[PDB]
């Protein structure tokens, strides 16, 4: 509803300072590290606040839909909110770093933290501290809950899987080296599973699972199986929207075809090309020179990407309903649809 979700929404954002407080209030005056804590306060302020905030809100939704009435107390609520910002902090730590390893300039419409003059390679240690902050907030609000160790293990494992996923990206598409050989479907796919799927979709539901007491390996697997599907599709959509989309598109209607980027668009292009294009492409992708980019898009209309999308997005939604059956046995399908309803959207 255009009422609850935003209500859910304003509560979350209304929580941020509190978290900031948790993190630096005592540190700030500490005669020894006080200088370190202050800076964290700024590190925190610049980078954390800033997305649409979905991933975090997803904990809060699920929890609000999984818990029984015993569990809807306020503290229980606050914890949901806190574990949410925990995912938001984790992601920030990552983004901070993708940017340095990508020599990027802009993020979430502000100049990258590393580029702020005086920062530099030091953002390496600020990302760590951001990463530290997540387990600091967990100790803070859940250290005495039966699910504490599961949560710790869950944040930590997913960190490892996204990194692996980052590795694959790193090794596959260097941003100072074109090479289209490895831009392969399998690769692309495994890149997405690892680098964003787990942290963006599974992690938030899994956390509300452990919070309500569902700690069965086969149920995490049932959830895992369907959220990963979602998350794959989602990244694809994001990929389809960076080129072929525009009308009221999520703020910045920019691009990175220019950036030798492993995108679903490219990958589909590859497999569906004549050595003529396979070279026409092979040469102009990574190209920050307008003529080039423009050409790149031509090739795609030339090959008719957008329709293949519409056949994809379509296959996708079908396959979701199915796995909502085979796998939403003990859990509330209402969880997967509400999240699904805010996902498959499309633009032609």
User: Which residues of the chain form contacts with ligand GPP (CB under 6 A)?
Assistant: 94, 97-98, 102, 125, 128, 162-163, 166, 169, 195-196, 256
- Which of 27, 52, 31 has its CA nearest to residue 40? 27
The item of Mg ion, ligand GPP, a second copy, none sharing an interface with residue 139, based on CB under 5 to 8 Å by kind, is a second copy
Q: Residue number with the shortest CB distance to Mg ion?
A: 102
Task: Tell me the torsion sign for CA atoms 137, 138, 141, 144.
Answer: negative
Query: Residues 168, 223, 257, 299: which binds a second copy (CB under 8 A)?
Result: 168
Token pair 């599709």: residue:
233
Does residue 183 interact with a second copy by CB under 8 A?
A: no
Cβ closest to a second copy, residue 120 vs residue 213: 120
Q: How far is the CB of 97 from ligand GPP (least distance, A)?
A: 4
Binding part of the chain for a second copy, among 145-153, 251-259, 295-303, 334-342 by CB under 8 A, reads: 145-153
Cβ closest to ligand GPP, residue 263 vs residue 328: 263
Cα 226 to Cα 9, 66, 201, 220, 321, distances in angstroms: 25, 17, 10, 10, 9
Does residue 193 interact with a second copy by CB under 8 A?
A: yes
Q: How far is the CB of 4 from ligand GPP (least distance, A)?
A: 28
Query: Residues 13, 42, 160, 185: which binds a second copy (CB under 8 A)?
Result: 160
- Which of 133, 156, 124, 148 has its CA nearest to residue 20? 133
Cβ closest to a second copy, residue 65 vs residue 215: 215
3-class SS of residue 207: helix
Cα 347 to Cα 52, 92, 163, 248, 304, distances in angstroms: 19, 28, 31, 10, 15
Alpha carbon distance 2, 126 (integer Å): 37
Token pair recorded at residue 116: 């702020």
Residues 22-61 binding a second copy (CB under 8 A) are 32-33, 35-37, 39-40
Footprint on this chain of Mg ion (rule: CB under 5 A): 98, 102, 169
Footprint on this chain of a second copy (rule: CB under 8 A): 32-33, 35-37, 39-40, 97, 100-101, 103, 121-122, 124-126, 128-129, 132, 135-136, 139, 148-149, 152-153, 156, 159-160, 163-168, 170-171, 190, 193-194
């Amino acid at each position: 509803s255009p009422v609850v979700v935003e209500r859910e929404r304003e509560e979350f954002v209304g929580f941020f300072p509190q978290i900031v407080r948790d993190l630096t209030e005592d540190g700030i005056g500490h005669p020894e590290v006080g200088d370190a804590v202050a800076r964290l306060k700024e590190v925190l302020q610049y980078n954390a606040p800033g997305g649409k905030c979905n991933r975090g809100l997803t904990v809060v939704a699920a929890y609000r839909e999984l818990s029984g009435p015993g569990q809807k107390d306020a503290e229980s609520l606050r914890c949901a909110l806190a574990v949410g910002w925990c995912i938001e902090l984790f992601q920030a730590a990552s983004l901070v770093a993708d940017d340095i390893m990508d020599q990027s300039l802009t993020r979430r419409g502000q100049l990258c933290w590393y580029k702020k003059e005086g920062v530099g390679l030091d953002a390496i240690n600020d990302s760590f501290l951001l990463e530290s902050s997540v387990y600091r907030v967990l100790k803070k609000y859940c250290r005495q809950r039966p699910y504490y160790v599961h949560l710790l293990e869950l944040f930590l494992q997913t960190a490892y899987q996204t990194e692996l996923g980052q590795m694959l990206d790193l090794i596959t598409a260097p941003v100072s080296k074109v090479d289209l050989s490895h831009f392969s479907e399998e690769r692309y796919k495994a890149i997405v599973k690892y680098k964003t799927a787990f942290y963006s979709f599974y992690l938030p539901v899994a956390a509300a699972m452990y919070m309500v007491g569902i700690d069965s390996k086969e149920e995490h697997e049932n959830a895992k199986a369907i959220l990963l599907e979602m998350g794959e599709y989602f990244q694809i959509q994001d990929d389809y929207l960076d080129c072929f989309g525009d009308p009221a598109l999520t703020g910045a209607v920019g691009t990175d075809i220019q950036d030798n980027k492993c995108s679903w668009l490219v990958v589909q292009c590859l497999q569906r090309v004549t050595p003529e294009q396979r070279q026409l492409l092979e040469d102009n992708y990574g190209r920050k020179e307008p003529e080039k980019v423009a050409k790149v898009k031509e090739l795609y209309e030339a090959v008719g990407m957008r329709a293949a999308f519409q056949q994809y997005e379509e296959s996708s939604y079908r396959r979701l309903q199915e796995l909502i059956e085979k796998h939403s046995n003990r859990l509330p399908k209402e969880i997967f649809l509400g999240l699904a309803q805010k996902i498959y959207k499309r633009q032609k």
